């Protein structure tokens, strides 16, 4: 398809916009992680439920470092 390619182009644009938004909101994610989060709230899930998970998981990897 052709419009599916330009749609995919626009999804790269949106994930780069979100990458700017993440880097000046200065989160611990990289690109590939926030992609997985975008999958999570594309299907519909709580950001307040994901945030507590990411907030202890980033603290449970400095606990045995």
């Amino acid at each position: 398809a052709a419009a599916a390619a330009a749609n995919l182009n626009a999804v790269r644009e949106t994930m780069d916009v979100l990458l700017e938004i993440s880097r000046i909101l200065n989160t611990g994610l990289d690109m590939e992680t926030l992609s997985i989060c975008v999958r999570l709230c594309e299907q519909g899930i709580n950001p307040e439920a994901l945030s507590s998970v990411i907030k202890e998981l980033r603290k449970a990897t400095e606990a045995l470092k």
Binding site: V17, E20, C41, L57
Partner: protein, 108 residues
């Protein structure tokens, strides 16, 4: 279906455990599903989120990084073309603050 796959991938990547026979992975996965199957959460209000985006933009102009502030308002205005928006947004908001960057590699 793919939600459960995404949950397993997120916990494996973020917790940095690449063995599924690690019992710590299993305890964290049980933790995650017990958190997901629990709800005590204030279901988010979009109007509060819009006010929050405005307040972040104001804190940007107060601390005088005008390129960051104007690019931020422009990016959020372009982004809100065409619910999933606000979900993603409030996630990004909630996850971290107390520091700020200044947007390298920006000419567009």
């Amino acid at each position: 279906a793919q939600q459960e796959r995404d949950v397993r991938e997120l916990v494996r990547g973020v917790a940095g455990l690449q063995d599924e026979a690690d019992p710590n992975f299993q305890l964290a996965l049980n933790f995650a599903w017990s958190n997901f199957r629990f709800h005590r959460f204030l279901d988010v209000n979009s109007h509060k989120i819009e006010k929050t985006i405005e307040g972040i933009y104001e804190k940007f102009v107060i601390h005088s990084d005008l390129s960051k502030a104007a690019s931020w308002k422009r990016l959020t205005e372009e982004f809100l073309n065409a619910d999933a928006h606000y979900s993603i947004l409030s996630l990004l908001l909630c996850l971290s603050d107390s520091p700020s960057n200044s947007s390298y590699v920006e000419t567009p």
